[PDB]
Write a protein that binds this ligand. Structure first.
Ligand SMILES: NC(=O)c1ccc[n+]([C@@H]2O[C@H](COP(=O)([O-])OP(=O)(O)OC[C@H]3O[C@@H](n4cnc5c(N)ncnc54)[C@H](OP(=O)(O)O)[C@@H]3O)[C@@H](O)[C@H]2O)c1
Ligand SMILES: NC(=O)c1ccc[n+]([C@@H]2O[C@H](COP(=O)([O-])OP(=O)(O)OC[C@H]3O[C@@H](n4cnc5c(N)ncnc54)[C@H](OP(=O)(O)O)[C@@H]3O)[C@@H](O)[C@H]2O)c1
Lengths: 336, 345
């Protein structure tokens, strides 16, 4: 290996939706040496994650045009130059969209994989940054108690599916919405939710919510926004929490959708708390040692829509925003 | 034993703003005697209060609003907060010379059954009895409970409060100042902003109505963004604040009178920002904390009596005015706590 290196780049700033045309392919050639830098390691990017924050990251902390779009991925140390990383092991964290990248590890972008008795695809979704985010947001920011109704929202996907699974381990009554009957079956089937509805087979969303929850929503895990939020507010419960994890139904408009119903948080006494996963990474290694018994035991599960190659990685990032993605969108770039 | 007790009533459920018309008057004759059943007391309503909550209790009954809540049964009188003197026995902790505050009807001679976070006995007289409908009562309990146990302020923090010339936003700004915060306020009247700037304390304030790009103004007052936000307003305000906010910014949602007399509630766009800069919106209801009311007095009653807490009012006589009075809040014709004297003392 003193190879060529393929990279998926960004042309220029996406207005509205992202499309395959706002991404271009290019070949650099990499020397597999130590290499040149300071606390650097060279790596072979194994897997990539299709992260929805990326849209916000590609409009005019924003990736520079002409340079590969950066994003989370799990990788293997080719050559080292960093104390912690032996010249042959597994990492995850921010990396370029390439086969061969050079990143100098830092404690909260880059973690080090010390459990391989589980897929190295999980560490871009379940045992990776969506997992910390489902752990963090549902445990701290929602502050769940037992027996109480949890509405989850892009539930099939990356963050959504551990929340209803964590919540059902508590023993709540969980419901979840998803866009198609493939995903809405996955929910009650695979992760045994207590109900699940296809929000795209509905006009009556407030009434949809009001039907799925007889006695109202104590907790709502927010992964989407707008219309959905507004029905959830009518539906919310007294002293019930809403942890705002994100708003996919907003990242893409060049005109942000307007919410009405906030007036309800007075009467119903709603905490609405918008977190960020980063802040909880000191609790990462506690999450890991908590879930890792449940996965390899058949208690926590996952579902990941796995593309193959950087070639099929624009057709993949774009797929999140409409909903091609069935579960976590990962991108296999090196099979091992 | 009859005594002719006048009243004020609601014709019908309101849609939009109240007007003097949605209320009718009428009279009756209460027989002045010892009330029975539960632990009941016949009272004599000296004062009464115009608080903007009464509009969500005037509208047609939604479950959403039924959590505050359940509208006034159209035809019998209006229920509200007022000061009252015990005209008869009925109960243990209430002697017939006595004087409570709480929820009475809009009538001359109410009868009440005094519940623990309903009816509160006045003990202290050295202060105007009209203070038990502002500062020493419920709207006073809001600014205390909403800013200490809800905005979780830290000394030095930037603060913005709105509807800053009314029973809550003028005592908030002072509890704010009492810990070196940078309270700025807002109000619509050209002179109302002058009570904020001078009389109440605020470091700056503005006239939102003389102000056109709302957010430009909050960008001026706080060049270093807004840590806390007390809100008695909503809509177009909350979107300027959410832009201007700081990280780990907090918001206490007391009320949103703007939205209240809208049939067609305004759209709050900018709510997405809170995912970036870990903002917390929290809606509370003062009613929940009336345990920390003994404690609140204990606090305020020293600070007022010493020049640390200033409080303007707006008085007006009898029920005849209490329509025009209650309808004046929504248009901002109350230059402080709007009180109505049924019968002075
Ligand atoms: N809190 C944090 O710090 C944190 C961390 C990471 C990511 N996030 C954010 O939250 C999301 C990521 O994970 P994920 O669990 O949502 O799954 P994902 O599968 O990774 O992302 C795509 C999903 O978006 C949904 N979707 C797209 N447009 C939608 C719309 N207009 N309305 C409703 N649903 C829509 C689709 O579900 P349907 O087919 O069912 O409609 C699809 O499954 C992103 O918005 C991301 O920016 C937050
Ligand atoms: N438990 C709770 O959550 C709780 C408890 C008590 C009260 N509240 C609520 O919060 C408010 C407190 O009452 P208060 O006695 O302190 O007096 P207040 O809010 O000052 O009421 C009158 C004021 O409303 C302002 N106003 C009128 N229309 C407005 C509009 N469209 N936009 C912005 N401001 C407008 C006027 O001034 P400017 O034009 O000068 O701005 C006027 O000074 C009420 O809405 C009440 O229902 C909530």
């Amino acid at each position: 290996m003193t190879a060529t290196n393929k990279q998926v780049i960004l042309k220029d700033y996406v207005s509205g939706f992202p499309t395959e045309s706002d991404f271009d392919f290019t070949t650099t050639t990499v020397e597999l040496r130590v290499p040149e830098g300071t606390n650097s390691v060279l790596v072979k990017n194994l897997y990539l994650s299709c992260d929805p924050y990326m849209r916000i990251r590609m409009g005019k902390q924003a990736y520079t045009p002409g340079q590969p779009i950066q994003g989370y991925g799990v990788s293997r140390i080719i050559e080292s130059g960093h104390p912690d990383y032996k010249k042959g092991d597994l990492l995850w964290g921010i990396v370029a969209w390439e086969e061969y990248s050079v990143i100098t590890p830092m404690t909260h972008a880059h973690f080090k994989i010390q459990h391989t008795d589980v897929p190295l695809s999980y560490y871009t979704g379940l045992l990776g940054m969506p997992g910390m985010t489902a752990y963090a947001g549902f445990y701290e920011v929602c502050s769940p108690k037992e027996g109480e109704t949890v509405y989850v929202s892009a539930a099939s996907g990356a963050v959504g599916q551990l929340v209803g699974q964590l919540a059902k381990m508590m023993g709540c009554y969980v419901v979840g919405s998803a866009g198609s009957k493939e995903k809405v079956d996955l929910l009650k089937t695979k992760f045994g939710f207590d109900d699940a509805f296809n929000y795209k087979e509905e006009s009556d969303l407030t009434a949809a919510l009001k039907r799925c929850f007889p006695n109202g929503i104590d907790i709502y895990f927010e992964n989407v926004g707008g219309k959905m939020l507004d029905a959830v507010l009518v539906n919310m419960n007294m002293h019930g929490r809403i942890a705002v994890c994100g708003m996919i139904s907003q990242y893409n408009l060049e005109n942000q959708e307007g919410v009405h119903n906030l007036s309800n948080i007075i009467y119903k006494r709603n905490r609405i708390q918008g977190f960020v996963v980063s802040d909880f990474y000191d609790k990462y290694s506690k999450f890991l040692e908590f879930v890792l018994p449940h996965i390899r035991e058949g208690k926590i599960t996952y579902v990941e829509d796995v593309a193959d190659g950087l070639e099929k990685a624009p057709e993949a990032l774009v797929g999140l925003f409409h909903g091609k993605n069935v579960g976590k969108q990962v991108v296999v770039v090196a099979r091992e």
